[PDB]
Design a protein around this ligand. Sequence first.
Ligand SMILES: [Mg+2]
Ligand SMILES: [Mg+2]
Ligand SMILES: [Mg+2]
Ligand SMILES: [Mg+2]
Ligand SMILES: [Mg+2]
Ligand SMILES: [Mg+2]
Ligand SMILES: [Mg+2]
Ligand SMILES: [Mg+2]
Ligand SMILES: [Mg+2]
Ligand SMILES: [Mg+2]
Ligand SMILES: [Mg+2]
Ligand SMILES: [Mg+2]
Ligand SMILES: [Mg+2]
Ligand SMILES: [Mg+2]
Ligand SMILES: [Mg+2]
Ligand SMILES: [Mg+2]
Ligand SMILES: [Mg+2]
Ligand SMILES: [Mg+2]
Ligand SMILES: [Mg+2]
Ligand SMILES: [Mg+2]
Ligand SMILES: [Mg+2]
Ligand SMILES: [Mg+2]
Ligand SMILES: [Mg+2]
Ligand SMILES: [Mg+2]
Ligand SMILES: [Mg+2]
Ligand SMILES: [Mg+2]
Ligand SMILES: [Mg+2]
Ligand SMILES: [Mg+2]
Ligand SMILES: [Mg+2]
Ligand SMILES: [Mg+2]
Ligand SMILES: [Mg+2]
Ligand SMILES: [Mg+2]
Ligand SMILES: [Mg+2]
Ligand SMILES: [Mg+2]
Ligand SMILES: [Mg+2]
Ligand SMILES: [Mg+2]
Ligand SMILES: [Mg+2]
Ligand SMILES: [Mg+2]
Ligand SMILES: [Mg+2]
Ligand SMILES: [Mg+2]
Ligand SMILES: [Mg+2]
Ligand SMILES: [Mg+2]
Ligand SMILES: [Mg+2]
Ligand SMILES: [Mg+2]
Ligand SMILES: [Mg+2]
Ligand SMILES: [Mg+2]
Ligand SMILES: [Mg+2]
Ligand SMILES: [Mg+2]
Ligand SMILES: [Mg+2]
Ligand SMILES: [Mg+2]
Ligand SMILES: [Mg+2]
Ligand SMILES: [Mg+2]
Ligand SMILES: [Mg+2]
Ligand SMILES: [Mg+2]
Ligand SMILES: [Mg+2]
Ligand SMILES: [Mg+2]
Ligand SMILES: [Mg+2]
Ligand SMILES: [Mg+2]
Ligand SMILES: [Mg+2]
Ligand SMILES: [Mg+2]
Ligand SMILES: [Mg+2]
Ligand SMILES: [Mg+2]
Ligand SMILES: [Mg+2]
Ligand SMILES: [Mg+2]
Ligand SMILES: [Mg+2]
Lengths: 147, 141, 117
Amino acid sequence: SKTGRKMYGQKGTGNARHGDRSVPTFVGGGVAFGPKPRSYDYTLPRQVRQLGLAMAIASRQEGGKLVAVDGFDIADAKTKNFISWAKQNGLDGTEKVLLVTDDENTRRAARNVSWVSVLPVAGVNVYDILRHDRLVIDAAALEIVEE
Amino acid sequence: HDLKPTPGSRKDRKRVGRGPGGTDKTAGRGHKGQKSRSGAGKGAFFEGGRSRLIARLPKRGFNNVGTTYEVVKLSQLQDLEDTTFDRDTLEAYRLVRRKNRPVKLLASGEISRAVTVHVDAASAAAIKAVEAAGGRVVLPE
Amino acid sequence: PRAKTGIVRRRRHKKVLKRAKGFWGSRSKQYRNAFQTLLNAATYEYRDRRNKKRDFRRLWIQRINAGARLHGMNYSTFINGLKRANIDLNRKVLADIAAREPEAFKALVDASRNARQ
RNA sequence: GGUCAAGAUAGUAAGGGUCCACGGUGGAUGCCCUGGCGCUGGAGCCGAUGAAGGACGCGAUUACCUGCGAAAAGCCCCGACGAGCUGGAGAUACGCUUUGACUCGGGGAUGUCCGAAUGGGGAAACCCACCUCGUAAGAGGUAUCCGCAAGGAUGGGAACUCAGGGAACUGAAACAUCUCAGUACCUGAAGGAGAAGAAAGAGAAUUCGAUUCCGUUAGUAGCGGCGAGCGAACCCGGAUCAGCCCAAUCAAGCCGAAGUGGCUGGAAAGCUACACCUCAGAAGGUGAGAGUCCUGUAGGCGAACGAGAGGUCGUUGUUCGUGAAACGAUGACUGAAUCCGCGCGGACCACCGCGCAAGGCUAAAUACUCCCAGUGACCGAUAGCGCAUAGUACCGUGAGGGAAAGGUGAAAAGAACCCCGGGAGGGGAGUGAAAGAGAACCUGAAACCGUGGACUUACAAGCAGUCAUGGCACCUUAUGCGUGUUAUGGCGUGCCUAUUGAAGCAUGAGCCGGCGACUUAGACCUGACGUGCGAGCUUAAGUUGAAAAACGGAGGCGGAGC
RNA sequence: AACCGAACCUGGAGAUAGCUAGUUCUCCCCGAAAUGUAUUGAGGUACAGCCUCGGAUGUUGACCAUGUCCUGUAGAGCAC
RNA sequence: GCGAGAGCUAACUUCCGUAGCCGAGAGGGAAACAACCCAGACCAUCAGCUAAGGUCCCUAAAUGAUCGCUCAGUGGUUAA
RNA sequence: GUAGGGGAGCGUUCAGUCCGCGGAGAAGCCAUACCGGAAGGAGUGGUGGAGCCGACUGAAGUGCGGAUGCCGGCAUGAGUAACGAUAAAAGAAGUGAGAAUCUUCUUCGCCGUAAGGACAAGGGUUCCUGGGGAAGGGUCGUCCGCCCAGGGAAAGUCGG
RNA sequence: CUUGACUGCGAGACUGACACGUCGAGCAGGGAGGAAACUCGGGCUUAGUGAACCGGUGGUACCGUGUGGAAGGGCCAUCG
Ligand SMILES: [Mg+2]
Ligand SMILES: [Mg+2]
Ligand SMILES: [Mg+2]
Ligand SMILES: [Mg+2]
Ligand SMILES: [Mg+2]
Ligand SMILES: [Mg+2]
Ligand SMILES: [Mg+2]
Ligand SMILES: [Mg+2]
Ligand SMILES: [Mg+2]
Ligand SMILES: [Mg+2]
Ligand SMILES: [Mg+2]
Ligand SMILES: [Mg+2]
Ligand SMILES: [Mg+2]
Ligand SMILES: [Mg+2]
Ligand SMILES: [Mg+2]
Ligand SMILES: [Mg+2]
Ligand SMILES: [Mg+2]
Ligand SMILES: [Mg+2]
Ligand SMILES: [Mg+2]
Ligand SMILES: [Mg+2]
Ligand SMILES: [Mg+2]
Ligand SMILES: [Mg+2]
Ligand SMILES: [Mg+2]
Ligand SMILES: [Mg+2]
Ligand SMILES: [Mg+2]
Ligand SMILES: [Mg+2]
Ligand SMILES: [Mg+2]
Ligand SMILES: [Mg+2]
Ligand SMILES: [Mg+2]
Ligand SMILES: [Mg+2]
Ligand SMILES: [Mg+2]
Ligand SMILES: [Mg+2]
Ligand SMILES: [Mg+2]
Ligand SMILES: [Mg+2]
Ligand SMILES: [Mg+2]
Ligand SMILES: [Mg+2]
Ligand SMILES: [Mg+2]
Ligand SMILES: [Mg+2]
Ligand SMILES: [Mg+2]
Ligand SMILES: [Mg+2]
Ligand SMILES: [Mg+2]
Ligand SMILES: [Mg+2]
Ligand SMILES: [Mg+2]
Ligand SMILES: [Mg+2]
Ligand SMILES: [Mg+2]
Ligand SMILES: [Mg+2]
Ligand SMILES: [Mg+2]
Ligand SMILES: [Mg+2]
Ligand SMILES: [Mg+2]
Ligand SMILES: [Mg+2]
Ligand SMILES: [Mg+2]
Ligand SMILES: [Mg+2]
Ligand SMILES: [Mg+2]
Ligand SMILES: [Mg+2]
Ligand SMILES: [Mg+2]
Ligand SMILES: [Mg+2]
Ligand SMILES: [Mg+2]
Ligand SMILES: [Mg+2]
Ligand SMILES: [Mg+2]
Ligand SMILES: [Mg+2]
Ligand SMILES: [Mg+2]
Ligand SMILES: [Mg+2]
Ligand SMILES: [Mg+2]
Ligand SMILES: [Mg+2]
Ligand SMILES: [Mg+2]
């Protein structure tokens, strides 16, 4: 908002020449080469999504920070039960752990945990996994997601 | 955070100007010129002031679209395809895909094992060398 | 995200202004004149490194010339008879001998002359 | 040792110079947020029952703001809250309220004057009326057009939509067809969207089947001083689906788990030893960083009221620039058939196909974003809107232009009181952790002005440096390669830009801060590096889920040239 | 309505600008061009020529002797 | 500098050709001096030999050696 | 080694992530003789008062001496020029913290078809009383057309 | 005496930044003069020229939009 109007004399003043006050070299004026609204997103080709995901799992298997899980004894949706179960599978408390299951109860148990994250069903990604120390595997959709 | 990027898979851009290091002044542009100017349009076919080769030359013919024919090759019905036959959708679910065009079969390779074809048209030497190796060619009505 | 100069410029600048001291007027106090003064100063440093290599050589020389002449010898003749008897002395040293060590210069003289004739 | 003689060198600084110490000026920088900015989503009209927007008023004291309207910082009724309240505003005195105030949600009542203004006039907010009822004080009515009446219209709305009107600069390296572009702007109307819509259609398969939207076909078919340049559609995938009739749950609120001991500290939330909660570890406040103080969150409840035809002539539209010009479209002339009929299939003819003109409405997907909310590899005081707020100050007869503005402390505990002065200002005291925070109140850069100190400077010629040596001074990366300063020497043509050639008597610039310029987009082109699959490679629109991503073959690239 | 051969304001609008300025971090390697040819073109653009990077190739380059043909200048001469 | 043209065997002249140089080249020399003579600066050294060009003092280095010339300050700016 | 192409990197922010520091003190700022081939980066000391360094990776409004550049501050010129008509001032008296300038007195000097008086247009409390003195006043001010507070304006015949 | 002042071509080179331009053996169809071997796709040669575009004209039956036709268009020729 700095109206077009020629400001003063094109020649004559003894001053440098200007046109508007809306200009890159002016305090107040508009920015030259600024950022605008865009979107840095693209479509990374399928192939390498799959190969990554995999390579992550793997990277943590030969770790070996995998814990392939077939069950969960965490009473009714309570957190302390999570902490206990955890304690007895090898979960000291000094790592970041990423749940993948399908049972609402286990998550509801796994949520408030400062040292743990709760990824539901499929929404799994090289990030979260590498983002962490441990994968709560689980087991169900692992050998069947193999095939 | 573990990771790292493939050596040479990301080149850091050029920010021209900035020092004598460095690309001093000018910004690649040299001293003066029409090229020197913050302004679009030049463009790419603008030779001289002038009149261009481009428009100095004979306009021959015109532009007909026409029916253009989809290639099928001998050495592709041949070798290790082990005749699952051509059928219709079958060759499609293999390695000859377009739609809204007619398929043509023509030579290139050699011929052995007997096969019957299912194409929209074909070359003389093709029907010739495929019958002479044990199989027909189905041309529509 | 935008990134003001914030800090960097003051940094660069001070660097110069700390190189820039002892300098007379504005030179030691305003950036532009400072950095500038230093461009030229650069020229003078480089050249005057090799230069002092010349100048000292000159100094040694005149001291030896003296020495020679202090008896009856020319510089050129002394130094030449000190090439002839192969007495391969640096001339910096020769100056040293000449001005801090009398009777030694005496002998080196008698030598050069002997080897000359 | 005195006199004379010859010769050599010292000290003083009016002032200045270099360095150092110490303030001043100023307000860069760091920190912070009370203000922005964009994206997603929600929500979307007001008004003759007087709108937007104002003028003047209402206060114990009232200039600005805010709220309000002569019932005038408020009034009645209901509902939530339960202890404070008496607007920012920080001030006294007056008071109010557990019979339930204040604040919140929800209706009502009162609402001067101006403004579509509308009883008539008027230079908006003022002047003068006429009529009906009243005892007066008052109250109502008195515009204009459509109407029998009842009733509707007038004016406003950032953009969004439709329509009547319709530029130029520009580009074609000149210009005129042409391009800019039916763009800017003007105007009309209307809504929360609108427009469009139920085939004389696309069309070429004897296929689809109202429209609008996106993907795609596709920079393909074509247009063009065949120059610049301009550029479809059918099909294929999605979004959302509709076709009807006539003329012979959110909006106030409530309820919600679980820690203490010692330690540093001005201050605990931090350190520590042991604790418990979690469907609650999102966040914010508390003397410095709190899962377990507070407000909250997960969760659970949740209201009386509340919200869901043809032809001819001049032309033009689509890719349509008179080109073979079809068709629609209208200005002026003409104005046929109605079923064994009418219209189209890009001149025109037969054939053979697709179609029912002359009558109307239509949700849905779509566009926008004044406003509300959520987020952020968006900004934090030259940024960010113009504004930490203000369209104000200021300029302009007017249209219109239009600023800089931020920070005491944890809390005012805001400095009683003594001292010099009329004061201003300061020096104590006293508070605080700190007054190295004291209201010109966070840091406090640099230019710039000064006090003190070191070493120097009054026979000297200078881009102000360099380099060598001597002097003097200093000793916290620092007693040696030293550091500060200096005398003497050698040497030496500011920087930038512009150029055949710059110290140039050629351009620029007082100095220092801070802002200041090779970028973004497209799923275009072509290359280099890399990667994943590899005679194979790949999705887009969308769909679903979304503290993540998967689905999506419609199309694209390779496949064979001429 | 304080500068009228075409008011001022807002807007298209960041019109265009073959023109003039300006274009900031550092070290290393290479390293030009102001010639030709066209151009409503002459202080501007196209293509070559010249730089540089990289993939191919293999001594094809370069100077120098030899051998071998082409020439009509310097000098000279008066045969047109 | 050498070749020629236009000029006036004028120009810090202009238009070609040709070699080198500056342009884009610092260092020594020519007092001073883009072009000239020597020479192509990867840093360090208070180390040595040379080039052009120099060796009375300024100013490094023979006031050198022998056979001579000019006496005019020629040297240290021109001609019939 | 100029235009130019190539090579490796220094610093700035925002971001993901880890190492981790901080009221026995963060960033920022200030001094310095250390280190790195350079962009740069460390040690310690003084400042400050609540936040921040480092490694790896990602994205940029990413590095200024120039543009007669823009905003702001402060320098030069300089204690210079000027203090706005050459109608002209003196002495006494008073007041005050302070007086060439403000208030009395007595004179002098200037206007007098004005430099007097009354209206209109315009301005808007500038009027009067009491007070103030930061700034406005071209010096000074105890004074004012400036600051504060309070008062003042009256129509049937003037004017609409 | 004659119509090589010829169709269909083009080995290989000169030349030019490009576009052009220049020479040409030889092959075919089919000719001309010689009795023949032969020679000829213009003149002793080097000047006697104008790219595209839009259009006229003589062939040609490649395109012609539901289909078969015609407009129109393409190709060879050519004229401005
Ligand atoms: Mg000036
Ligand atoms: Mg580069
Ligand atoms: Mg330039
Ligand atoms: Mg040039
Ligand atoms: Mg040497
Ligand atoms: Mg003094
Ligand atoms: Mg008000
Ligand atoms: Mg109530
Ligand atoms: Mg309450
Ligand atoms: Mg009332
Ligand atoms: Mg009225
Ligand atoms: Mg024009
Ligand atoms: Mg033009
Ligand atoms: Mg309207
Ligand atoms: Mg017509
Ligand atoms: Mg038209
Ligand atoms: Mg028609
Ligand atoms: Mg600041
Ligand atoms: Mg601002
Ligand atoms: Mg005081
Ligand atoms: Mg001093
Ligand atoms: Mg003297
Ligand atoms: Mg002296
Ligand atoms: Mg520069
Ligand atoms: Mg010049
Ligand atoms: Mg000068
Ligand atoms: Mg100059
Ligand atoms: Mg000039
Ligand atoms: Mg590749
Ligand atoms: Mg005028
Ligand atoms: Mg425009
Ligand atoms: Mg402009
Ligand atoms: Mg080289
Ligand atoms: Mg030239
Ligand atoms: Mg080129
Ligand atoms: Mg060779
Ligand atoms: Mg001759
Ligand atoms: Mg010239
Ligand atoms: Mg040049
Ligand atoms: Mg040189
Ligand atoms: Mg030289
Ligand atoms: Mg010299
Ligand atoms: Mg010269
Ligand atoms: Mg010699
Ligand atoms: Mg000497
Ligand atoms: Mg970070
Ligand atoms: Mg920070
Ligand atoms: Mg500047
Ligand atoms: Mg000037
Ligand atoms: Mg004076
Ligand atoms: Mg003066
Ligand atoms: Mg004077
Ligand atoms: Mg004076
Ligand atoms: Mg006066
Ligand atoms: Mg006077
Ligand atoms: Mg008296
Ligand atoms: Mg008194
Ligand atoms: Mg007076
Ligand atoms: Mg008067
Ligand atoms: Mg008065
Ligand atoms: Mg005053
Ligand atoms: Mg008084
Ligand atoms: Mg044309
Ligand atoms: Mg024809
Ligand atoms: Mg025809």
